[PDB]
């Protein structure tokens, strides 16, 4: 028996919006600790990992570790039957062929319950090296998403160069060349507005903007975002779902 | 070097929105008095002339006259990355077959800058005589934009009639007929809303709605538009830019 009541139902729609496009399907592994999901994209390039800790739910009961095989579109489709405003309960019994969601309004006048058919998945885990990283940048999520948007006009790939004063996104291709220069900010106000960099050693790395643009679909999950790179080591783009967990995407740089 | 630094970036964006779907490649004639463009459209039907006077930039430095062949589509693409409040500099290097664009935000902590490949292009230049026109209608830009758009469901050409009473836009097709009667509004101050007919004589000419509708893409450049006409002489559709210059399209009537 699994049952979790999430006051901020919106969190669950947002996650799906972010993933439906990258992942056709995935095992949602549930433990008393919480809901954690990890999977590679249909084309085996990038790695997305999700973590909703039990702590973060207004009701949580897992009895038994179950791994639920889910079609992210189908689950997106159903979550769009729930209001932003709505509270969302997930129920599931042991060895379920089905997961059940419930949506309760501000008035509780309308109550919706759906049953989404599960599936079987032959997917085995990937071990995630814990690391210290050469550079860690933190900045508005929108501002990141905007950069990877604008520069997608310019060329296939983006070049992130890291320096103490500021971090710098560049691209090129048939159109020409472009460079976006983000200086670090004194602030203090506002944290959302802030930029801050942690340089152990400087980085200069190159990645596909195909995938970065896919990742920034997580943008409405947090007003800020977090880049973690080291040379020849897979990037981590990280959105913090407040007071619960995080959604991290991991991506291979050039050579 | 040529360095030109315009507070109101949006102007530049707006301008390229206007011409991009009309002209594939254009020659940007820079001199010390300012920036002029003149080109026919792809199908050699209408003609476009741009004038941004140097007076109108916060900074304008021109070492020498210049003739920049620019692929407008690609110039448009770069300006699209440009933010609206953005302070845009256009910089050119004497040797260069390279146009540099520089966008700085009011944010003052992000700075984008791009470069684009200039090309060698042949400039043939039609002389446009100064003139006096039979009627000259001053109406608001949006209204005109709407009028051409609605009539384009009705038939393939519009008719524009003026007297001193007002101006009648008419069309007809397999569908039926439309007549849109704007009665004059000069007496009210009506700085934005007003319709004025400085008629010297009546006029009644027939224009291709297809081409007027490209022209109306300049609408965001100015709250008003002006049509200058006379028989068998082409139409001047004029959009001011604020103290900076204007964007005129020229288009020929029936017979």
């Amino acid at each position: 028996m699994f049952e979790a009541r999430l006051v901020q139902g919106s969190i669950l729609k947002k996650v799906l919006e972010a993933l439906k496009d990258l992942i056709n399907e995935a095992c949602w592994d549930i433990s008393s600790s919480g809901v954690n999901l990890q999977s590679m994209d249909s084309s085996h390039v990038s790695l997305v990992q999700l973590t909703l800790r039990s702590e973060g739910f207004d009701t949580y009961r897992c009895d038994r570790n179950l791994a639920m095989g889910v079609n992210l579109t189908s689950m997106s489709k159903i979550l769009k039957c729930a209001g932003n405003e709505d509270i969302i309960t997930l129920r599931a019994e042991d060895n379920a062929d089905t997961l059940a969601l419930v949506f309760e309004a501000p008035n509780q006048e309308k109550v919706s319950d759906y049953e989404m058919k599960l599936m079987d998945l032959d997917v085995e885990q990937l071990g995630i090296p814990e690391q210290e990283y050469s550079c860690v940048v933190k900045m508005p999520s929108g501002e990141f998403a905007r950069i990877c948007r604008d520069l997608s006009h310019i060329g296939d790939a983006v070049v992130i160069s890291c320096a103490k004063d500021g971090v710098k996104f560049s691209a090129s291709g048939e159109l020409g060349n472009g460079n976006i220069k983000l200086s670090q900010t004194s602030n203090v106000d506002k944290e959302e507005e802030a930029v801050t960099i942690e340089m152990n050693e400087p980085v200069q790395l190159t990645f596909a903007l195909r995938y970065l643009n896919f990742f920034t679909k997580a943008t409405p999950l947090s007003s800020t975002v977090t880049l973690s790179m080291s040379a020849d080591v897979p990037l981590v783009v990280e959105y913090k779902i407040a007071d619960m967990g995080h959604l991290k995407y991991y991506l291979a740089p050039k050579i | 070097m040529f360095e030109a630094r315009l507070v109101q970036g949006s102007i530049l964006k707006k301008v390229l929105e206007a011409l991009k779907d009309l002209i594939n490649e254009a020659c940007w004639d820079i001199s010390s008095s300012g920036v002029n463009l003149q080109s026919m459209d792809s199908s050699h039907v209408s003609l476009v002339q741009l004038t941004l006077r140097s007076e109108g930039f916060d900074t304008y430095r021109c070492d020498r006259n210049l003739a920049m062949g620019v692929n407008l589509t690609s110039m448009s693409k770069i300006l699209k990355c440009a933010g609206n409040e953005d302070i845009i500099t256009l910089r050119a290097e004497d040797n260069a077959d390279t146009l540099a664009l520089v966008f700085e935000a009011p944010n003052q902590e992000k700075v984008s800058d791009y470069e684009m490949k200039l090309m060698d292009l042949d400039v043939e230049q039609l002389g446009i005589p100064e003139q006096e026109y039979s009627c000259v209608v001053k109406m608001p830009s949006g209204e005109f934009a709407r009028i051409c758009r609605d009539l384009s469901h009705i038939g393939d050409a519009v008719v524009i009639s003026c007297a001193k009473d007002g101006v009648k836009f008419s069309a007809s097709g397999e569908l039926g007929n439309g007549n849109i009667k704007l009665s004059q509004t000069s007496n009210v101050d009506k700085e934005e809303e007003a319709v004025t007919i400085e008629m010297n004589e009546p006029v009644q000419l027939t224009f291709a709605l297809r081409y007027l509708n490209f022209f109306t893409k300049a609408t965001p450049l100015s709250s008003t538009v002006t049509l200058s006409m006379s028989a068998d002489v082409p139409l001047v559709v004029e959009y001011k830019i604020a103290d900076m210059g204007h964007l005129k399209y020229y288009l020929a009537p029936k017979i």
């Binding site: 590679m40 084309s43 085996h44 390039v45 990038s46 790695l47 085995e124 885990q125 990937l126 071990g127 995630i128 090296p129 990877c148 948007r149 604008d150 997608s152 006009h153 060329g155 296939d156 790939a157 596909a208 903007l209 195909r210 643009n213 080591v233 897979p234 991991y250 991506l251 291979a252 050039k254 050579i255 | 699209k80 990355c81």
Partner: peptide, 23 residues
């Protein structure tokens, strides 16, 4: 008004398989 030009995958892109091992 900028959309996302959604891009091709570089020929040089290596999959996350080659950087992390199966659990």
């Amino acid at each position: 008004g900028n959309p996302v030009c959604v891009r091709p995958t570089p020929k040089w892109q290596k999959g996350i398989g080659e950087f992390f091992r199966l659990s």
